[PDB]
Amino acid sequence: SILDGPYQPTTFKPPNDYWLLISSNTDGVVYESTNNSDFWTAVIAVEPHVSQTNRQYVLFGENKQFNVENSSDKWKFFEMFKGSSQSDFSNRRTLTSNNRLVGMLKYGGRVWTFHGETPRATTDSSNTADLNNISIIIHSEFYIIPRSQESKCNEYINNGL
């Protein structure tokens, strides 16, 4: 099947040319991805209707507090990015979604994810010189979809499983 899964939470270096479609089941860290060279992204899930609150997360072994908020009726998935070991995280992208799926693809020297607000979320890329070595710790169930079937992945991100 085009939609391969769901797989249990795990750690691995995903193969290039496949979307990971990650199904978030609670608030907190959805995944932590890095090559320990030029790419770090952790995604943090915040449930609907959350007034500003200090929450603490473990990101790549380090405790980080963020004041988070979500005034919408949809879940929000915040990408926290840094591009070097010695740099501060920034909320680089956000996906606002009732479907509670995020996507990550390693392809052609870039990491691709979905951002924006469903059902109109789009893909966006980050460059890396060290793509293959990007590993991911995934804290919930996920699926694997070939890049050739990205249209299906897009459909799931935007309209749900």
Ligand X SMILES: CC(=O)N[C@H]1[C@H](O[C@H]2[C@@H](O)[C@@H](CO)O[C@@H](O[C@H]3[C@H](O)[C@@H](O)[C@H](O)O[C@@H]3CO)[C@@H]2O)O[C@H](CO)[C@@H](O)[C@@H]1O[C@@H]1O[C@H](CO)[C@H](O)[C@H](O)[C@H]1O[C@@H]1O[C@@H](C)[C@@H](O)[C@@H](O)[C@@H]1O
Listing DSSP states for 23-80 in one string gives E--SSEEEEEEE-SSS-EEEEEEE-SSEEEEEEEEEETTEEEEEEEEE-SSSEEEEEE
Q: Pick the binder of ligand X from 135, 149, 150, 152 (CB under 6 A).
A: 150
Q: Which amino acid is at 84?
A: S
Burial status of residue 73 (CB atoms within 10 A of its CB: 0-12, 13-18, 19 or more): exposed
Among 5, 147, 149, 152, contact with ligand X (rule: CB under 6 A):
147
- Calculate the CA 99 to chain-centre distance: 13
The pairing of beta strand 75-82 with beta strand 101-107: unpaired
Q: Minimum distance from CB of 115 to ligand X (Å)?
A: 9
Q: Shortest gap between Cβ of 37 and ligand X (angstroms)?
A: 18
Shortest distance (Å) from residue 116 CB to ligand X: 9
**Min separation Cβ 144 and ligand X, Å:** 14
Q: Count the residues of the shown chain that bind ligand X, applying the rule CB under 6 A.
A: 11
Residues 79-138 that bind ligand X (CB under 6 A): 105, 107-108, 110, 112, 122-123, 125
Helix H or strand E segment including 158: helix 150-159
Of 60 and 107, which CB lies nearer to ligand X in the complex structure? 107
Residues lying near ligand X in the complex (CB under 6 A) are found at 105, 107-108, 110, 112, 122-123, 125, 147, 150, 154
